[PDB]
Amino acid sequence: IAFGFADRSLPHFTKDDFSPESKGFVENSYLRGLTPQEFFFHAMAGREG
Amino acid sequence: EITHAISSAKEQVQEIIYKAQHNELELKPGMTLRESFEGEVSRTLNDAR
Amino acid sequence: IKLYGREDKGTGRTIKATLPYVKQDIPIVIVFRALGVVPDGEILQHICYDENDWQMLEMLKPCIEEGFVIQDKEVALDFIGRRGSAALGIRREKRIQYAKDILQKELLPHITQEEGFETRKTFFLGYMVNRLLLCALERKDQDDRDH
Amino acid sequence: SFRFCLECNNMLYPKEDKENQRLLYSCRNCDYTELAEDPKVYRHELITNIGETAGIVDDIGQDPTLPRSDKECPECHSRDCVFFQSQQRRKDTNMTLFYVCLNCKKTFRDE
Amino acid sequence: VSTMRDLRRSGAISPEVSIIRDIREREFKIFTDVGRVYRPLFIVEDDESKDNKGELRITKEHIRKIQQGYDDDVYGWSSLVTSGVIEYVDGEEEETIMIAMTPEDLQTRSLNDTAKRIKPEMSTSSHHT
Amino acid sequence: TPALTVYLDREIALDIEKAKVIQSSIEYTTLKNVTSATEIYYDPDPTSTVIEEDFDTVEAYFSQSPWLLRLELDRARMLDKQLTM
Amino acid sequence: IKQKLETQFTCLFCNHDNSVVCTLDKKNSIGLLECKKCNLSFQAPINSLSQPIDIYSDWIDACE
Amino acid sequence: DDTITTEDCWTVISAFFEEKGLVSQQLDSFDEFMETSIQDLV
Ligand SMILES: [Zn+2]
Ligand SMILES: [Zn+2]
Ligand SMILES: [Zn+2]
């Protein structure tokens, strides 16, 4: 997931954060349910398809 | 077991960030530092899942 | 405002602008002079705010020399009017006064359109050139059209 | 730093004085001329590092979007700073971080 | 910017105005343009001059007055906006703020329920503001 | 994505050291690739130099236009590519 | 190389339209207007940026 | 004071739709056109 905001993927993260959760790793299963940050990233990948 | 394998994969991604930011990361042939960095993180996370 | 010159191709790497209702691209220095600020040293004082930045100053070098021979306001304004989609034969005595309208209005009309306020357009023009070179110097990403 | 004539404000060009065998800086709209302090006339950096560190501003610590670190300032030894990777937008740019102490505004790294 | 921000949070300036400080590029942009898309957010107290810090500005007292419809000497949505507890941000101003996802994320906690979802660790920055 | 697949003779293909020799001869290297900086000086005396840095270099070595073209090679890229002055 | 260009300008003397030819010599910075009808000629200095409308403008001011 | 709960968040949201509804960006925009924009265009 690209830095579509200035140096971050979403305004809920600090800048220059390259960790898994920051750049689109969805840790939860569909059973467990996705968090709000993960949800949007999943919708970005899904839209591209 | 599931939660452990994901937890340990997030730690390895931290180590990769540390190495790349302290100039201790191996450069892959044909690739810049940032390409090599992005490449190694992706391989780790897909193997984790 | 277009920056010509490819990578090691395009020789003199100068900068020309495009103005509404003028058929051809006009170099930047000429329009600066055409607004009432003519010596080089003031022009560069309006664009670059860092006298040490020699990379940026080297890229403005060819623009000065390609617009050196236009050394005053009157011949600058006439150089413009001779391209601006008009009729043939409006003479210098008036072809200036037609181009002064194309500069006062139509060119950046959101800043102001009353007379005797050309200081705002000259200062703004310098800002644009500054932003243009920051991207060409790879100090700032190009803008994201989808933001 | 390239300079302008102090009486005409137009730019000076370097020109040699053949008779006295010395380098001058000459104008092009008038007769003013002066002596050159520097034999160097032009430099072209192919492998460049300029603008890596450059954007150091006084209010960068007021930006709440920047991450904070524990690194010890060499000057004042404060435990409160902001950090950021290089603002150079080249494709080969390193990922090494710059830290800025909010007190003395010095820039250091983790090497 | 602090003064200007406080004028919007009181109502002296129309609440739909954008006040955008870009610190890195040393630019300060204000927009009163028509057609900007905006959304509301809760304001979190960020000034280290009060015990209020780190918590939501909105309290159950506002919530009490909302359900009644009147103040204790019409009171609806816009009453909250001109009393500094909610403000509007557009896409440009959103670039410069730091948003917590839920009120519970404003404070650190003390689980292991294998059915429920994992909350992110958030360990790249030591302290968030 | 233009690309060549270059198989090597058998005797060379099982000896990595000889293959590296082939590698460096095929790869295009320009002067621009190894140059770090170029400079233009006014050095009016052909037998000397105002540059204190190149003083001991040019004085011992020696034992036309006044404009000097001075270009600097990067040691790291020159060492990796195995090129001599 | 010189540029020999026909124009749609009217000669200031004979009044025939579409009969003024412009010869721009940039190697020596000398522009030349010619009339294909009455045969008059007018010379003026040109830069590198000039075009047939630049010297034809200088010809209008040289008469008035 | 105390902490804002999930139910309290919906009380705030209820106040929004009570005042503004769902199509206020259509209605307010057109209202501004009749009150002022026509006059300015003249
Ligand atoms: Zn002068
Ligand atoms: Zn300090
Ligand atoms: Zn004729």
Side-chain angles (χ1 to χ4, degrees):
Chain A
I1 300 305
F3 285 166
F5 291 88
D7 298 322
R8 45 181 183 163
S9 69
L10 283 181
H12 311 84
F13 297 101
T14 67
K15 292 187 162 70
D16 290 339
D17 189 348
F18 304 95
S19 53
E21 60 267 22
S22 168
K23 287 183 79 69
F25 182 71
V26 174
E27 184 175 350
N28 294 295
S29 69
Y30 288 130
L31 175 62
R32 261 150 175 214
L34 282 62
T35 69
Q37 299 95 17
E38 294 175 323
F39 183 85
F40 196 78
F41 295 147
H42 187 46
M44 291 169 74
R47 172 75 60 81
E48 185 189 14
Chain B
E1 287 184 352
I2 286 165
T3 300
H4 199 266
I6 290 176
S7 292
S8 63
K10 291 162 77 180
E11 289 169 9
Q12 306 174 31
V13 173
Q14 286 308 315
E15 295 188 353
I16 294 167
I17 288 165
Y18 183 87
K19 290 191 195 66
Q21 288 181 334
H22 288 56
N23 228 6
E24 300 171 10
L25 192 73
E26 298 175 346
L27 265 63
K28 275 187 81 46
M31 275 179 182
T32 67
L33 164 66
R34 298 180 168 190
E35 297 169 353
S36 313
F37 168 72
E38 283 301 329
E40 187 191 0
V41 176
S42 291
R43 295 184 327 265
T44 305
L45 289 175
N46 290 325
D47 290 341
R49 181 203 49 204
Chain C
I1 295 182
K2 313 179 182 70
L3 168 62
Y4 287 85
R6 185 53 66 187
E7 179 178 355
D8 306 339
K9 193 64 67 66
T11 56
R13 271 150 179 181
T14 69
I15 305 175
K16 307 184 276 305
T18 287
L19 302 183
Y21 305 110
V22 316
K23 293 172 165 291
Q24 202 176 3
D25 293 330
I26 304 173
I28 308 291
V29 179
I30 305 182
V31 315
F32 266 110
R33 301 202 163 167
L35 283 154
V37 288
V38 294
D40 299 338
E42 264 162 358
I43 297 185
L44 267 46
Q45 184 194 0
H46 281 71
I47 302 176
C48 179
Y49 315 95
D50 192 337
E51 45 155 28
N52 281 320
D53 200 342
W54 59 267
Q55 292 177 356
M56 188 181 300
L57 283 168
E58 186 70 45
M59 184 164 301
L60 288 165
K61 182 75 75 170
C63 315
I64 304 302
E65 298 176 359
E66 206 195 4
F68 177 76
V69 315
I70 306 299
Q71 295 187 8
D72 72 347
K73 185 173 185 181
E74 283 172 20
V75 311
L77 282 161
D78 206 87
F79 183 87
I80 295 175
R82 286 171 182 180
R83 295 177 176 182
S85 173
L88 295 176
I90 281 60
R91 92 205 182 257
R92 179 257 165 185
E93 188 182 341
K94 294 179 71 67
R95 187 167 292 261
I96 290 179
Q97 185 63 58
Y98 169 70
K100 292 169 58 67
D101 295 331
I102 300 191
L103 269 57
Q104 172 172 334
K105 307 187 173 181
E106 305 301 330
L107 166 89
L108 303 170
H110 71 279
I111 299 175
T112 196
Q113 289 179 356
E114 34 173 343
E115 298 196 352
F117 273 129
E118 64 281 11
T119 59
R120 276 151 174 179
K121 303 196 178 181
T122 47
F123 269 116
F124 196 87
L125 266 190
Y127 178 76
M128 276 199 190
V129 186
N130 188 4
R131 187 170 175 102
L132 181 59
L133 300 178
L134 295 176
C135 181
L137 289 163
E138 294 190 357
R139 295 179 189 171
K140 196 172 175 294
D141 287 323
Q142 68 178 323
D143 283 334
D144 185 348
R145 195 181 283 93
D146 299 319
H147 198 298
Chain D
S1 67
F2 272 17
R3 308 174 39 63
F4 303 113
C5 164
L6 299 188
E7 301 165 0
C8 196
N9 208 8
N10 287 111
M11 72 164 300
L12 307 174
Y13 299 82
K15 187 170 61 59
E16 176 185 24
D17 188 30
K18 286 155 176 176
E19 295 78 32
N20 198 20
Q21 280 209 326
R22 64 183 181 171
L23 178 59
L24 299 174
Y25 277 103
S26 169
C27 171
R28 200 163 286 183
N29 305 274
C30 86
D31 283 326
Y32 179 90
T33 302
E34 62 181 24
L35 198 61
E37 296 185 355
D38 200 331
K40 188 192 292 291
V41 183
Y42 169 84
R43 180 169 170 89
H44 184 201
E45 286 191 3
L46 287 70
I47 310 180
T48 186
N49 295 326
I50 303 178
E52 189 176 10
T53 54
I56 301 183
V57 305
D58 308 337
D59 294 317
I60 187 183
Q62 297 180 336
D63 189 347
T65 74
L66 291 171
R68 292 176 72 233
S69 185
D70 293 8
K71 289 295 161 296
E72 176 173 330
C73 179
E75 203 73 30
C76 73
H77 301 255
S78 292
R79 193 64 64 92
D80 171 68
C81 58
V82 294
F83 62 98
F84 51 98
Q85 72 175 359
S86 175
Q87 303 301 290
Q88 177 78 42
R89 307 312 297 174
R90 288 191 66 176
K91 304 171 65 177
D92 54 356
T93 301
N94 198 336
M95 288 186 58
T96 51
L97 295 176
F98 293 161
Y99 300 78
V100 171
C101 177
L102 299 182
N103 196 173
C104 68
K105 292 170 190 172
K106 187 189 174 60
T107 307
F108 58 92
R109 317 158 71 91
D110 289 335
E111 300 180 359
Chain E
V1 301
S2 177
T3 308
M4 294 292 115
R5 183 162 285 113
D6 287 331
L7 292 168
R8 196 185 63 189
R9 301 185 168 182
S10 74
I13 297 186
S14 169
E16 67 162 6
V17 166
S18 270
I19 299 169
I20 314 150
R21 174 178 186 184
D22 187 349
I23 290 174
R24 303 299 299 269
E25 295 284 351
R26 295 197 303 260
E27 293 185 359
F28 178 49
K29 293 163 293 82
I30 296 171
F31 286 153
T32 70
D33 208 8
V34 53
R36 287 168 296 112
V37 193
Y38 62 94
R39 57 185 198 107
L41 297 166
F42 284 145
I43 294 173
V44 172
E45 185 57 35
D46 54 340
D47 195 336
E48 191 72 0
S49 62
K50 279 172 69 184
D51 293 342
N52 195 34
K53 196 269 175 183
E55 313 180 14
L56 292 173
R57 285 196 180 172
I58 190 181
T59 63
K60 318 280 296 294
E61 293 303 304
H62 300 89
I63 310 297
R64 209 261 315 250
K65 304 182 184 177
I66 285 297
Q67 295 168 325
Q68 290 173 358
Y70 61 93
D71 204 340
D72 306 335
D73 189 6
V74 78
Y75 186 91
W77 168 261
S78 294
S79 299
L80 305 176
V81 177
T82 54
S83 62
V85 303
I86 293 172
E87 61 180 2
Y88 300 127
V89 297
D90 77 335
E92 204 63 25
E93 181 168 345
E94 197 168 6
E95 195 71 42
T96 68
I97 70 177
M98 183 73 198
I99 310 184
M101 188 57 70
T102 57
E104 303 184 9
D105 297 325
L106 289 170
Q107 299 302 336
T108 322
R109 57 186 178 186
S110 168
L111 295 318
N112 284 317
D113 173 75
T114 64
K116 83 173 184 173
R117 79 194 71 185
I118 296 177
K119 295 299 188 65
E121 182 187 1
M122 302 289 298
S123 64
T124 48
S125 179
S126 53
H127 182 256
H128 303 89
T129 50
Chain F
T1 312
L4 297 183
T5 299
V6 182
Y7 302 98
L8 300 170
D9 290 321
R10 177 166 186 80
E11 285 188 350
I12 303 182
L14 44 79
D15 185 283
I16 188 179
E17 292 302 324
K18 296 175 174 184
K20 276 182 285 185
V21 177
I22 310 292
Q23 172 179 22
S24 63
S25 66
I26 290 181
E27 189 174 1
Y28 198 53
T29 309
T30 62
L31 176 62
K32 187 179 169 186
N33 289 138
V34 290
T35 299
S36 60
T38 75
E39 286 167 329
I40 293 184
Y41 293 94
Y42 182 78
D43 203 8
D45 183 22
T47 50
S48 182
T49 178
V50 187
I51 301 303
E52 309 174 20
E53 298 178 345
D54 308 333
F55 192 70
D56 301 343
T57 298
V58 310
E59 288 298 309
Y61 166 80
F62 281 96
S63 306
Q64 59 190 357
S65 177
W67 297 104
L68 175 73
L69 179 65
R70 189 178 177 256
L71 56 85
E72 185 186 2
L73 305 185
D74 183 273
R75 179 179 307 277
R77 309 195 181 185
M78 286 285 294
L79 172 67
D80 166 48
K81 300 290 194 169
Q82 306 172 13
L83 288 162
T84 76
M85 293 297 115
Chain G
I1 303 297
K2 295 187 188 181
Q3 315 164 244
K4 193 168 187 303
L5 308 164
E6 279 187 345
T7 66
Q8 309 179 47
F9 307 147
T10 289
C11 168
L12 310 184
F13 289 81
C14 71
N15 266 12
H16 279 255
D17 46 42
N18 308 332
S19 68
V20 176
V21 166
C22 186
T23 300
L24 297 171
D25 186 35
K26 289 184 174 179
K27 304 175 180 179
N28 299 276
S29 301
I30 294 181
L32 175 71
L33 286 176
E34 290 173 285
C35 184
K36 316 185 309 186
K37 289 292 188 172
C38 72
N39 302 330
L40 68 77
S41 285
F42 170 79
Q43 186 173 355
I46 63 168
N47 44 49
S48 275
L49 289 60
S50 65
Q51 289 158 110
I53 195 65
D54 281 301
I55 178 181
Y56 182 80
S57 299
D58 288 334
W59 187 24
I60 303 164
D61 315 307
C63 277
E64 304 166 346
Chain H
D1 297 329
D2 213 19
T3 73
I4 290 295
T5 62
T6 292
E7 171 186 334
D8 299 323
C9 294
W10 291 108
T11 294
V12 173
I13 287 167
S14 301
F16 181 95
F17 290 113
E18 173 63 44
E19 181 177 357
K20 294 190 159 183
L22 286 167
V23 292
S24 67
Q25 73 292 335
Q26 292 265 325
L27 295 171
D28 300 340
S29 184
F30 179 81
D31 282 336
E32 181 67 17
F33 169 79
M34 300 298 292
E35 282 158 353
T36 307
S37 301
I38 295 173
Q39 182 72 46
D40 286 355
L41 281 176
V42 158

